[PDB]
Amino acid sequence: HHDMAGVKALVTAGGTREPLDPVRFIGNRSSGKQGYAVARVLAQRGADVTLIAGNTAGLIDPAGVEMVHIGSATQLRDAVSKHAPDANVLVMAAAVADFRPAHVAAAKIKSSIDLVRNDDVLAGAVRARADGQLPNMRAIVGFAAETGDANGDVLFHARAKLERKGCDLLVVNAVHNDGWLLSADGTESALEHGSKTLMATRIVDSIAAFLKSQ
Amino acid sequence: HHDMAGVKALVTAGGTREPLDPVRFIGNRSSGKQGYAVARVLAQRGADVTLIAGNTAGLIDPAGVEMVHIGSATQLRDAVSKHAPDANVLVMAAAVADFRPAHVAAAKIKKGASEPSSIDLVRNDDVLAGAVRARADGQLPNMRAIVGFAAETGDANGDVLFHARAKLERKGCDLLVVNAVGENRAFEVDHNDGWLLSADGTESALEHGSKTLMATRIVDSIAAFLKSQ
Ligand SMILES: Nc1ccn([C@@H]2O[C@H](COP(=O)(O)OP(=O)(O)OP(=O)(O)O)[C@@H](O)[C@H]2O)c(=O)n1
Ligand SMILES: Nc1ccn([C@@H]2O[C@H](COP(=O)(O)OP(=O)(O)OP(=O)(O)O)[C@@H](O)[C@H]2O)c(=O)n1
Ligand SMILES: [Ca+2]
Ligand SMILES: [Ca+2]
């Protein structure tokens, strides 16, 4: 039915672009499709959805969703801050750049590129809510792409990321391999590889169950 | 009619992406749409078109055009090398990255706690200049027209036409399409700075109109150049 009726949901999706000059940037390969899918399913289930979108694979605005377009990780941060005070659910599906060029050239570059860190927006929301600044925020959802490497298997890294971020739910993609839904209470649920819509339904199901538990 | 009948055209379009690791890259804001429009007009007018496409995942493949997909400027270079021997016209509409990161990480660079490491850059080969030189060295006997594209702006050192003329003579191409950019949309300002520059000294204004109109003017200019020879 419409379980999300009355819920205000803030979703980020797509990759950010960190400018080097007016023409060039550091970007990433995120398509935004999974984040758009979650926004679409939330709206379909009655939520009042605001979608902050960075760079996407040409995607169409989902119907009934309020669109906010950003470029950089800092612009995404400011857009999340602007829209956070009344949101009940934050879904951080955007591939947010960890670093940005330290200097942006005023004109086209005809030179090593120095980098500085961007703010961790997801962690900022978790801390703000813990510090009493987001009383309406009932669920904070992070996304992660994890792989096994010489320092640990994929699930080890995913669990560590849940613990460090402190969010309520971590949607993990193992990079047709299945992913995971990791909850802050320790629940771990396999996320089967299906269409983006079916996976979005499973993600939103988990959000709805978490909201009912609280 | 079909003036481009019998012409084999190799077109590059879109921006390139220069990897930092499997997920991140240096990129640019070019859409590839103007180059796609030139390929589409060439085919509509009878040309046998091969389109080497960069960062254009959401664009529709032009009908009747052979598609070649590349990622980086070096991959674009290699694709042009492979396909140029078949072409009579090379249309270099791609926004090719001048630089690439010197090191490509095997895995996505992790957010540590120490200071982030700068990115060293290295120059990518000038594909257009490489084609001009190969033709001059006798390696491209079928190549009748080499077309470059450039976005130029006036700055403290000169206006658009000053910079554009200098780039044409410098690149050594037969035609330089200057500022075939913009979408002619509401609230988009037209700086009336579009030009078609020929290596014989002819200079014609390129009106900023739709992508299809500009592609038609560009292909008209190619046809006029081919007929001049
Ligand atoms: N500057 C950033 C970076 C990431 N994110 C959010 O954090 C989650 C992904 O974090 P991740 O990149 O996996 O964690 P990092 O601390 O950056 O660790 P890593 O070294 O693996 O990149 C996503 O929800 C993403 O939207 C964010 O809010 N702000
Ligand atoms: N590594 C490169 C760079 C650009 N091009 C081609 O060169 C033309 C545009 O050149 P432009 O970027 O305007 O001149 P540059 O020599 O790169 O000078 P600038 O730094 O001003 O860009 C286009 O046709 C583009 O496809 C190319 O073949 N190989
Ligand atoms: Ca990161
Ligand atoms: Ca350039």
Author numbering:
A (entry chain A): 184 to 293, 300 to 364, 374 to 412
B (entry chain B): 184 to 412
What does the paper say about this structure?
The product of CoaB is then decarboxylated by CoaC, an enzyme of the homo-oligomeric flavin-containing decarboxylase (HFCD) protein family, to 4′-phosphopantetheine. Transcriptional silencing of individual genes of the CoA biosynthetic pathway of this pathogen identified CoaBC as uniquely bactericidal within the CoA pathway, highlighting it as a good candidate for drug discovery.
Screening for crystallisation conditions allowed us to find a different CTP containing condition that gave excellent resolution (1.8 Å). Nevertheless, a flexible loop (residues 362–377) that covers the 4′-phosphopantothenate site, when this substrate binds to the enzyme, can be seen in our MsmCoaB structure, extending away from the active site. A superposition of our MsmCoaB dimer structure with MsmCoaBC shows the loop extending towards the CoaC active site. This long loop (15–16 amino acids) is present in all CoaBCs and it is possible that it helps channelling the substrate from the CoaB to the CoaC active site. The CoaB active site is enclosed by a loop that extends from the opposing protomer. This loop contains a motif “K-X-K-K”, which is widely conserved in bacteria, with few exceptions, and each lysine either interacts directly with the triphosphate group of CTP or through highly coordinated waters. Also observed is the coordination of a cation by the triphosphate group and D281. While magnesium or manganese are the favoured cations for CoaB activity, calcium is observed in our structures instead, due to the high concentration present in the crystallisation condition.
